[PDB]
RNA sequence: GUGUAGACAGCAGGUCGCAGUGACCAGGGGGCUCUAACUGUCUAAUACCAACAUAGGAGAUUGCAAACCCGUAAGGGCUAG
RNA sequence: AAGUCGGCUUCACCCCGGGACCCGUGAAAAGGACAGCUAAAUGUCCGUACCGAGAACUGACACAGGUGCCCCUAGCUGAAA
RNA sequence: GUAAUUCGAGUACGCCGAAAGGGAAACAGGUUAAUAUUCCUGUACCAUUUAGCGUUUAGUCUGACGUCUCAGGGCAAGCCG
């Protein structure tokens, strides 16, 4: 049986490495809609899950009592915070953490 | 023989005009009750009736019989429905219309006693008890006519559930198509003036018009009784 | 009565909720149980037979809460300490 | 708490799913019926607004499980309430 | 930078060509009228239309052993209404 | 001949759960489970090749049509079959 | 019923109606020129029946269900070291 002649993938591996680095992926390479390339429900799900996990860890370690935790959780569900970094920045700015 | 009309096809009973009887839940009628007897049952579920687009009540009676009943307004699961000459005149009970006070709302009214319930059965509207006499009792129908029935004729106390169903406009051909899928009625319907003369008395012509008066005699034979049948009058009320 | 009913909770021990009310009736610590117009009787006829008095409220469990200061609904409201009040006398 | 009710957005309501089809009159009728049906309805068994339509004419309480037959788009109709109040007046009289 | 991740978004600088969605793939647009509201259906094999249908509006018959209709009849459709 | 390991992703397949709609409320019956364990015997009949289509069907044809389709399809580019 | 039938609606009792609905149970490898979950090797499973050992919980559940949308977990295929 003659050897199978495959399809080599090295010149796709190099491009994949560059794309991981963030190159070869500009506007002149994008061809699907923004939304086909990044679904909005997926974006929201990851954002809200990150915020919720952050609030859960805060209330677990004791930096956040239940009264302000409820309001912060509803704020996050309402989209007041861009990300965990934004949430932490708001917490440190308005001194919501029960520092000791 | 200019072709038979849609009415003659329906009378023939072809599949295009037959009801999808397999889609229906039950032949809704009052439970059979011997002379001077009663039976009590409990409502176990409220289901949708595809043959009526109205709720129906599933009822388990004392005698081990499970039966579908025309549901009245406010009938709830777990309610005890009584059927008898001595039953409380209350919503959902099956009582003779001679024991219903004047001005009360009834539905599912038997044409004759023990008939099973004939009148006032669609979703929402009712009949009113007007007068009582020794052998006759009068009810105002949803039509507006007065019907004299035997006082022993049974009826469920209340109105039929589902009032206001026709209040929402169809809004869409397919909306009504989905309802027509469950009924024998042909949907959609071609106007007679759009047909050829072989298909209807009104068909044909260089331009659309019946060509003859649309009020037809009551004596006209089948295949000709089309348009306004034996109309007392026509037009919008003056 | 409009103020006696409020003062019974303002200056008195009560436990709201059917579970805690049934527990109080079972263990006797409740002077009585106040039940709304919508509370069943399948379990409640036993506490009726028991020496724990059963008061009937004039309104539903939804509106029993606001008159006793609770934002929620209350069906069984067994009282422990009448306090600065004679709600037991009002019941019976 | 609700949607972004823009300077012009308060007309279509739930009939915004129909676009420019079917006419303002029927769009208004359908929207009003949807609003009335989606309004909260108090349960006659527990007295709290948890009655939702489960089907054409079937209404169920999410709290106590009380299920009953009512109007097609409204749990309680004026004719049914009139009948109930007539019988209540009779019962009070006797 | 976001995200647990897959990935996605964004930035700074350098640089080549006539041309960087480089091939492939991939709306031309606007103004004024007639007509039908619209999606839909149609002369399989010359007519995909303004015709048919449609929701909406109106009228008529009939209380059910009904109106309407099929059968010579027995008996049926509408009607598990 | 090696035949040992890790990681990522995962549709269009499997399990599970939630929500919305009604305007078609979306079948029935056999069978199965709820009391069975052990050991012997029995389990008959029919189909089964091959094509399933730009040559195995159908259209008189080795016919550019039509005929069930797949709950069939690998790498790169690309939203993507 | 019909002049009558091989004709005719309905009712009663039966009986059929799906190789894509429901459904008791088998897999991998090898073997031929052509068959292979069918033959061979290995390892299983199901049904009744017989004999022994024991027995109802009985009438319930399952079979058993629409359209759209979405979460979680897994996985055939795919990809990387």
């Amino acid at each position: 049986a003659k050897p199978v002649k495959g399809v080599s993938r090295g010149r796709a591996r190099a491009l994949a490495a560059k794309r991981k680095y963030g190159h070869c992926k500009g506007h002149g390479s994008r061809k699907g809609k923004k939304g086909a390339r990044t679904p909005k429900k997926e974006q929201w799900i990851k954002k809200i899950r990150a915020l919720r996990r952050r609030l859960k860890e805060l209330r677990a370690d004791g930096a956040l009592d239940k009264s302000v935790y409820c309001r912060l959780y509803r704020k996050a569900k309402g989209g007041e915070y861009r990300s965990v970094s934004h949430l932490n920045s708001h917490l440190e700015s308005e001194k919501l953490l029960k520092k000791e | 023989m200019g072709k038979r009309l849609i009415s003659q096809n329906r009378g023939r009973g072809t599949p295009t005009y037959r009801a999808p009887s397999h889609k229906y839940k039950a032949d809704l009628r009052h439970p059979r009750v011997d002379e001077n007897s009663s039976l009590r049952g409990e409502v176990v579920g409220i289901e949708h009736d595809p043959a009526r687009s109205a709720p129906i009540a599933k009822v388990a009676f004392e005698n081990g019989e499970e039966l579908f009943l025309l549901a009245s307004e406010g009938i709830a699961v777990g309610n005890i429905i009584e059927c008898g000459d001595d039953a409380e005149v209350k919503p959902g009970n099956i009582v003779p219309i001679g024991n219903v006070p004047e001005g009360f709302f009834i539905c599912n009214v038997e044409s004759k006693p023990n008939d099973g319930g004939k009148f006032v059965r669609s979703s929402g509207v009712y009949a009113t008890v007007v007068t009582h006499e020794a052998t006759r009792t009068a009810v105002s129908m949803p039509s507006g006519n007065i019907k004299w029935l035997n006082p022993k004729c049974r009826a469920v106390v209340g109105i039929v559930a589902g009032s206001g169903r026709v209040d929402r406009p169809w809004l869409k051909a397919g909306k009504k198509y989905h309802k027509m899928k469950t009924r024998a009625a042909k949907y959609p319907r071609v106007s007679a003036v759009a047909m050829n003369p072989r298909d209807h008395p009104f068909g044909g012509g260089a331009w659309k018009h019946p060509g003859k008066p649309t009020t037809v005699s009551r004596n006209a034979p089948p295949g000709r009784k089309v348009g306004l049948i034996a109309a007392r009058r026509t037009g919008m009320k003056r | 009565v409009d103020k006696s009913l409020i003062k019974a909770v303002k200056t008195g021990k009560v436990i709201v909720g059917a579970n805690r009310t049934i527990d109080a009736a079972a263990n006797g610590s409740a002077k009585m149980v106040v039940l709304a117009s919508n509370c069943p009787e399948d379990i409640k006829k036993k506490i009726q037979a028991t020496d724990i008095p059963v008061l009937e409220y004039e309104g539903t469990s939804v509106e029993l809460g606001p008159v006793c200061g609770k934002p929620f609904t209350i069906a069984a409201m067994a009282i422990l300490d009448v306090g600065e009040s004679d709600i037991l006398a009002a019941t019976a | 708490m609700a949607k972004k009710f823009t300077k012009k957005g308060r007309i279509s309501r739930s009939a915004g799913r129909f676009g420019p089809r079917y006419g303002r009159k029927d769009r208004k009728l359908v929207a009003d019926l949807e609003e009335r049906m989606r309004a909260p309805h108090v349960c006659t068994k527990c007295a709290r607004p948890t009655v939702e339509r489960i089907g054409t004419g079937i209404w169920k309480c999410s709290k106590c499980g009380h299920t009953f037959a009512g109007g097609t788009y409204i749990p309680y109709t004026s004719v049914g309430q009139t009948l109930l109040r007539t019988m209540k007046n009779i019962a009070e009289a006797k």
Side-chain angles (χ1 to χ4, degrees):
Chain A
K2 294 189 289 293
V4 165
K5 59 179 73 65
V7 182
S8 70
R9 210 170 163 296
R11 75 187 76 92
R13 299 187 189 101
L15 195 69
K18 290 182 183 292
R19 263 184 163 85
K20 195 98 197 161
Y21 196 69
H23 297 165
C24 282
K25 193 172 74 70
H27 284 97
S29 297
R30 296 182 178 98
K31 182 169 285 294
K33 297 277 287 160
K34 171 258 290 181
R37 299 171 56 80
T38 177
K40 53 178 206 81
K41 275 189 70 72
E42 276 192 27
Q43 296 276 137
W44 166 252
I45 285 166
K46 74 178 167 138
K47 143 167 180 175
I48 195 64
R49 264 151 192 199
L51 301 157
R52 270 153 196 196
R53 84 180 74 256
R54 176 65 178 150
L55 296 162
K56 288 180 184 290
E57 75 198 32
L58 286 154
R59 185 167 68 179
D61 60 44
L64 196 68
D65 56 356
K66 64 190 288 184
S67 53
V68 69
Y69 170 85
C70 198
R71 290 185 290 112
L72 273 177
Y73 193 96
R74 273 301 172 81
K75 292 284 189 178
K77 200 266 183 183
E80 295 292 329
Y81 309 120
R82 296 187 301 271
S83 77
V84 184
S85 199
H86 202 188
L87 184 45
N88 296 344
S89 71
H90 276 285
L91 306 183
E92 58 90 19
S93 60
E94 62 189 1
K95 315 310 280 185
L96 299 202
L97 278 73
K98 290 177 63 169
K99 182 264 289 183
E100 64 184 1
Chain B
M1 183 285 301
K3 306 291 286 293
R4 287 146 164 271
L5 303 174
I6 297 279
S7 67
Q8 318 190 252
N9 297 330
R10 189 184 290 99
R12 200 160 151 139
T14 65
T16 297
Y17 305 95
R18 294 194 158 248
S21 301
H22 49 274
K23 289 183 180 179
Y24 304 149
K25 298 286 179 67
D27 194 336
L28 299 179
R29 48 85 171 167
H30 294 152
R32 273 78 182 275
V33 183
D34 281 14
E35 185 180 1
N36 320 117
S37 295
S38 294
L39 75 165
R40 292 180 66 187
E42 73 178 3
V43 181
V44 299
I46 306 297
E47 289 188 34
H48 166 271
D49 185 11
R52 288 170 58 246
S53 299
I56 57 173
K58 187 172 175 66
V59 180
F61 289 96
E62 307 292 14
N63 52 11
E65 289 210 289
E66 65 192 6
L67 186 63
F68 271 117
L69 286 194
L70 190 151
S72 66
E73 183 76 27
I75 188 166
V77 162
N79 290 167
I80 307 312
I81 305 299
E82 290 185 352
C83 178
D85 296 331
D86 50 312
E88 170 158 46
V89 172
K90 181 179 71 175
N93 298 322
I94 301 169
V95 294
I97 54 175
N99 309 345
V100 174
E102 290 152 84
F104 268 32
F105 297 158
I106 59 171
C107 61
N108 204 0
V109 182
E110 293 183 332
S111 179
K112 318 198 316 310
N114 311 123
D115 199 359
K118 302 291 185 183
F119 312 117
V120 187
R121 293 164 55 101
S122 313
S123 57
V125 185
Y126 54 93
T128 303
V129 168
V130 176
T131 63
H132 282 252
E133 293 181 355
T135 46
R136 280 184 327 164
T137 182
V139 309
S140 167
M141 285 283 101
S143 303
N145 309 341
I146 296 298
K147 180 71 175 176
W148 286 100
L149 305 154
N150 192 316
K152 295 299 291 182
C153 279
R154 300 136 78 212
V156 296
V157 182
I159 68 169
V160 180
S163 162
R165 151 165 71 67
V166 302
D167 280 351
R168 187 210 188 287
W170 279 123
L171 199 72
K172 205 176 64 154
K175 179 72 178 296
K176 185 179 178 184
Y177 165 92
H178 292 306
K179 176 173 180 287
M180 298 294 109
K181 293 295 289 184
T182 63
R183 271 68 187 271
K186 178 68 170 65
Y187 188 80
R189 287 297 290 275
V190 188
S191 43
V193 295
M195 308 180 173
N196 293 125
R198 188 183 70 177
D199 288 324
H200 201 275
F202 298 166
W207 59 289
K208 309 280 221 299
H209 71 305
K212 63 190 77 174
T214 60
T215 57
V216 72
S217 179
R218 168 87 63 199
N219 199 266
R224 178 70 192 72
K225 202 169 272 181
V226 296
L228 315 195
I229 300 180
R232 272 67 165 265
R233 56 153 301 143
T234 58
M236 280 214 73
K237 285 267 148 181
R238 297 172 68 187
Chain C
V1 176
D2 61 356
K3 274 79 72 176
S4 81
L5 56 90
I6 310 162
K7 68 144 166 176
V9 62
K10 300 294 183 182
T11 64
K13 298 292 191 291
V14 294
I15 57 174
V16 299
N19 282 62
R20 296 205 70 62
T21 296
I22 294 169
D23 291 332
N27 77 83
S29 65
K31 272 72 177 174
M32 65 181 179
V33 301
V34 188
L35 277 67
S37 299
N38 309 71
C39 185
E41 295 292 326
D42 180 46
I43 299 170
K44 283 72 180 175
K45 67 176 74 69
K46 174 57 198 173
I47 61 170
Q48 174 169 2
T50 63
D51 56 355
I52 304 281
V54 171
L55 167 52
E56 67 93 22
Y57 186 64
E58 69 275 15
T60 61
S61 66
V62 173
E63 61 188 3
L64 181 42
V67 300
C68 311
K70 303 294 185 179
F72 41 92
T73 64
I74 305 181
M77 188 177 177
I79 70 169
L80 279 298
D81 188 357
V82 183
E84 288 80 3
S85 160
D86 52 15
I87 191 66
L88 203 44
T91 310
Chain D
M1 68 294 293
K3 189 45 164 38
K4 53 179 71 64
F5 293 169
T6 182
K7 187 266 179 183
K8 180 261 292 180
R10 315 202 320 298
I11 299 280
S12 280
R13 279 92 54 76
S14 68
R17 64 183 176 179
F18 299 126
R21 295 183 299 277
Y22 313 132
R24 72 187 301 171
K25 183 257 288 183
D26 286 327
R27 267 188 259 121
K28 184 177 184 295
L29 282 175
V30 180
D32 294 333
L33 190 65
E34 303 298 331
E35 303 209 293
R36 300 197 283 280
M37 180 175 69
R38 273 69 173 268
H41 315 293
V42 299
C43 187
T44 70
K45 279 207 153 282
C46 51
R48 66 197 144 190
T50 66
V51 159
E52 288 92 9
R53 175 161 89 122
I54 300 299
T56 295
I58 300 107
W59 298 80
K60 184 173 175 66
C61 176
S62 44
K63 301 293 182 68
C64 63
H66 173 228
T67 179
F68 61 97
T72 305
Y73 313 105
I74 296 299
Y76 309 106
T77 57
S78 67
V79 182
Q81 303 301 144
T82 298
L83 188 153
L84 291 190
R85 74 180 67 255
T86 295
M87 304 179 35
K88 178 61 66 68
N89 293 330
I90 293 171
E92 294 175 353
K94 304 168 183 146

